[PDB]
Write an enzyme that holds these catalytic residues in place. Structure first.
Site, PDB file in Angstrom:
ATOM      1  N   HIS A  41       0.806  -1.215   0.000  1.00 57.97           N
ATOM      2  CA  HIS A  41       0.000   0.000   0.000  1.00 57.97           C
ATOM      3  C   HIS A  41       0.843   1.272   0.000  1.00 57.97           C
ATOM      4  CE1 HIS A  41       0.660   1.334   4.140  1.00 57.97           C
ATOM      5  NE2 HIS A  41       0.255   0.181   4.640  1.00 57.97           N
ATOM      6  N   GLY A 143       3.722   6.686   9.993  1.00 61.79           N
ATOM      7  CA  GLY A 143       5.088   6.487   9.556  1.00 61.79           C
ATOM      8  C   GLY A 143       5.696   5.163   9.974  1.00 61.79           C
ATOM      9  N   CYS A 145       4.476   2.046   9.345  1.00 64.91           N
ATOM     10  CA  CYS A 145       4.225   0.919   8.456  1.00 64.91           C
ATOM     11  C   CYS A 145       5.528   0.388   7.872  1.00 64.91           C
ATOM     12  CB  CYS A 145       3.269   1.319   7.341  1.00 64.91           C
ATOM     13  SG  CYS A 145       1.608   1.679   7.943  1.00 64.91           S
TER      14      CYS A 145
END
Ligand SMILES: O=C(NCc1ccc2c(c1)CCO2)c1ccccc1
Ligand code: NA
EC number: 3.4.19.12
Lengths: 305, 301
Positions: A41, A143, A145
């Site tokens: 993603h 931030g 991920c």
């Protein structure tokens, strides 16, 4: 003496963490040999996130559309491809800090260390359990991920988790390093929710054994029970059922402390039915279920890495 | 979202851990540039542990009595000296893994990460706080002496603790990296006991602010308190006195949440009076005191 929630030393993983930017989205990647792994993603704009077609979104991106920074040095992406929900960026340089490693998928109830990361810079490390409902009670901000979870078995780092999203209740969802989600979640912005969770019974028992080894014995009693009787009580209090394989696993701890598993189950049944009566166990007022039997053995015998 | 006892990433300290051997005794040392730091009681013998004269024990040692092993490698000791309760072994190699670092002595209530090690190799990392009675509630087995505690704000490792001993209550005592003990303890096996421990009040308040920041308000109340009345109640629950310094420190968390510091002191007084009534705060059924105001700001939004 003493018993703490303790993570694996994180240095072997810190050397694998890199910053991945695609457009206006920056997150974290895992750099092993000549491949950077990150959530697929990363390629989505916030409008793409409502209902993305990842195969299509990826074809428009060129290799130089993925900016990878390892510390303050830029890496060259020479290839890109998708596996389940993780993106794989082939780079022109093998990570000289690549540790011996495997990708493993863990079972609910098993624990692991998370290296929380922002802009490819590690910021913290903590212990998590994969919940029965396949979420993890993490601590993450925007931030984070692409931060990863891992165990160290001997000298091999076993990677088991990569962070993808936060659910509305504040718990967290992610994949193994082959991109398969833990739990019935998808990487898109629609309505998703954690299922009702339950307590990891074998882990609570393991933690009671740790309490005994540290001199905390007030909950012990003369009684014992049966698997059938106890499992009926476990169902009543939303505990996972105890199986014969759990009893075998706790076998070492039963021999060391002289308290048989169903002997300890009688202790746990009385605690579930009556509470703690103002007392604590290893400094906790609630029954702790994020220590596996192996965790207790390792911390109480000092197996260094 | 979420709130976890988070330690610092340990890699920069992992690269400094070595094994120090003297006689039959092996423990851990900390290898920074060309010096290895370890607890001076590595030079004690079996029959001389109640009243060691370290100056006398040290002067009889030559450099080759110290065996220092960094990984699989043997380091050559070319000098030695004692500074208070730590031994400083000069070696012939500067550690190529030496991070930017400093030595900092911390005050009670401060938190730090501990990298537990055995035989020079790291076992695990966990978070700790310096208790008001100058002990720490750690997880240490035999051979963990020489493990260190640290923070890593920015890119610089601040070394604040080195583990020396376990007291009879199962709590732990040690020194700063200048070798000065935290609290009234000595590196002797004479009868020693930690003072009665107290709850770190400023930290509990920080953690309550953390709970609000993550969306939980059930424990607030319509009330306030003077600072002196709060301290009169809290001392009766074995809580540390709250100072005007502490109130100032909570100012930022107060501004971020909209709840005045003395309003939060009133919520704590009620919690002490009522308990939790089956509820939890940030996952705990107890009031947590090992998160500082600085910790809460770094971890929360
Ligand atoms: O701390 C423990 N040993 C370390 C130690 C402490 C003081 C001292 C020496 C060694 C030699 C000179 O004075 C310990 C205490 C209880 C159970 C197990 C170990
Ligand atoms: Na029993």
């Amino acid at each position: 003496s003493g018993f703490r929630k303790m993570a694996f030393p994180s240095g072997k993983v810190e050397g694998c963490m890199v910053q991945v930017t695609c457009g206006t989205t920056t997150l974290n990647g895992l750099w092993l040999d000549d491949v950077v792994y990150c959530p697929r993603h990363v390629i989505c704009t916030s409008e793409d996130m409502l209902n993305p077609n990842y195969e299509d979104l990826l074809i428009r991106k060129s290799n130089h559309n993925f900016l990878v920074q390892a510390g303050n040095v830029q890496l060259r992406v020479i290839g890109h491809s998708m596996q389940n929900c993780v993106l794989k960026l082939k780079v022109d340089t093998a990570n000289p800090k690549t540790p011996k490693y495997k990708f493993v998928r863990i079972q609910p109830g098993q624990t692991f260390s998370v290296l929380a990361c922002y802009n490819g810079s590690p910021s913290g490390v903590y212990q998590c359990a994969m919940r029965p409902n396949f979420t993890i009670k993490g601590s993450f901000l925007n931030g984070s991920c692409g931060s990863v979870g891992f165990n160290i078995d001997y000298d091999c780092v076993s990677f088991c988790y990569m962070h993808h999203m936060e659910l509305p209740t504040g718990v967290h969802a992610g994949t193994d390093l082959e991109g398969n989600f833990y739990g019935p979640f998808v990487d898109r912005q629609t309505a998703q929710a954690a299922g009702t969770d339950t307590t990891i019974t074998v882990n609570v028992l393991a933690w009671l054994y740790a309490a005994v080894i540290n001199g905390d014995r007030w909950f012990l009693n003369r009684f014992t029970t049966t698997l059938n009787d106890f499992n009926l009580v476990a169902m009543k209090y939303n505990y996972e059922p105890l199986t014969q394989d759990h009893v075998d696993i706790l076998g070492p701890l039963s021999a060391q402390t002289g308290i048989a598993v169903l002997d300890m189950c009688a202790s746990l049944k009385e605690l579930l039915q009556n509470g703690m009566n103002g007392r604590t166990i290893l400094g906790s007022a609630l029954l702790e279920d994020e220590f596996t039997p192996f965790d207790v053995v390792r911390q109480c015998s000092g197996v260094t890495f």
